[PDB]
Amino acid sequence: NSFLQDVPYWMLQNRSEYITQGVDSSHIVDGKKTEEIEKIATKRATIRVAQNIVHKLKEAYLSKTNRIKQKITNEMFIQMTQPIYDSLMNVDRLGIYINPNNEEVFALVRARGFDKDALSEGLHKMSLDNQAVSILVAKVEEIFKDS
Amino acid sequence: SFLQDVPYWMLQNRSEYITQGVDSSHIVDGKKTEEIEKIATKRATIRVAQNIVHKLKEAYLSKTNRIKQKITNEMFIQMTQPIYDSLMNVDRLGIYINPNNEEVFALVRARGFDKDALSEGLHKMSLDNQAVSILVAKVEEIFKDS
Ligand code: NI
């Protein structure tokens, strides 16, 4: 059975919510150099930051003190991922770890901010009304603040 | 700083295994290794219950949702204990000590659940027949898929 060596701390399971940090990976692709796979992994980890944000937005929407009036489905939450991702700013690649067994490339990233006006417009463009958008964007703003 | 002899199950990427859970307890002077493992194992088991709650929340928010009752995030959080209590045949599959943080991690897998116990627990927290029956069905589907 299988154990891994030289594993950085951020690769490990842990209880700790760095909502604006993302860890994710890319598998290898024949004909793509490892550096290319690191780029893909870094983008995937950045999408993961957006996924982390959407998760917090669903919980807020489900809360007894939700103020969003529009009905927002799970599928709509999933759709929010792209506009949130598109709005992320100043995202730093903090680390790379490669699993030598399958050569899967993991990236650690941190998004230092987001563009509230870009996020607003993206959310409008997926048919969320202005009351819903205002609350959603304010929530994302709190997440960056609290981070 | 780097960690050595890290088992696969300790990596960050295990969301797909809804019925598996990992969590830890801190090594403290005055506690026996066995009390510490027991706490980590309990916590790992609570993580399985939380994994299940998250799937229920997603199913409830889906456009396909047929549960008519209003269920709040706080109510979903409240479902964690009845789900935990209903878990059956929860096997401890590993222990890992992190020497950097002095944390003992446990890996568990729940092989199943008691749908009657879960029902009774959900009924006690004021979920209606329709909600309980559907939530229970969804948990059954999670275990079937596992
Ligand atoms: Ni418009």
What's the domain range around A136?
1-147
Task: Name chain A contacts of B60, Cβ cutoff 8 Å.
Answer: 62
Token code pair at residue B79:
């479902």
CATH of the domain at A14: 3.10.129.140
d(CA A45, CA B73) in angstroms, rounded, equals 27
**Contact A23/B22 with Cβ under 8 angstroms?**
no
DSSP A15: S
Experimental structure resolution, Å = 1.7
**Contact A81/A47 with Cβ under 8 angstroms?**
yes
Mutant choice from B12, B58, B104 vs A, greatest count of A C-beta within 10 A? B12
List, as own/partner pairs, every contact residues A13-18 make where C-beta atoms lie below 8 angstroms and the sequence separation is at least 24, other chains included: A13/B9, A13/B10, A13/B11, A13/B12, A13/B14, A13/B22, A13/B23, A13/B105, A14/B24, A15/B23, A15/B24, A18/A110, A18/A147
d(CA A4, CA A88) in angstroms, rounded, equals 33
Number of domains in chain A: 1
Q: CA-based angle B91:B39:B88, to the nearest 5? A: 30
d(CA A25, CA A144) in angstroms, rounded, equals 23
Please indicate the experimental technique that yielded this structure: X-ray
Residues whose CB falls within 8 Å of the CB of residue B23, separated by 6 or more in sequence, listed in order: A13, A15, B40, B43, B44, B46, B47, B105, B106
Q: What is the enclosing helix (H) or strand (E) of A106? A: strand A105-114
d(CA A33, CA A133) in angstroms, rounded, equals 41
The label of the residue with tokens 């830890």 reads B24
Neighbours of B102 (CB within 10 A): 12
Task: Name chain B contacts of A74, Cβ cutoff 8 Å.
Answer: 58-59, 61-63
Q: How far is C-alpha B120 from the geometric centre of its chain's CA atoms? A: 18
Residues whose CB falls within 8 Å of the CB of residue B72, separated by 6 or more in sequence, listed in order: A62, A63, A64
The dihedral sign for the CA sequence A69, A72, A78, A83: negative
A13-B14-A89-A73 Cα dihedral, nearest 10 degrees? -130
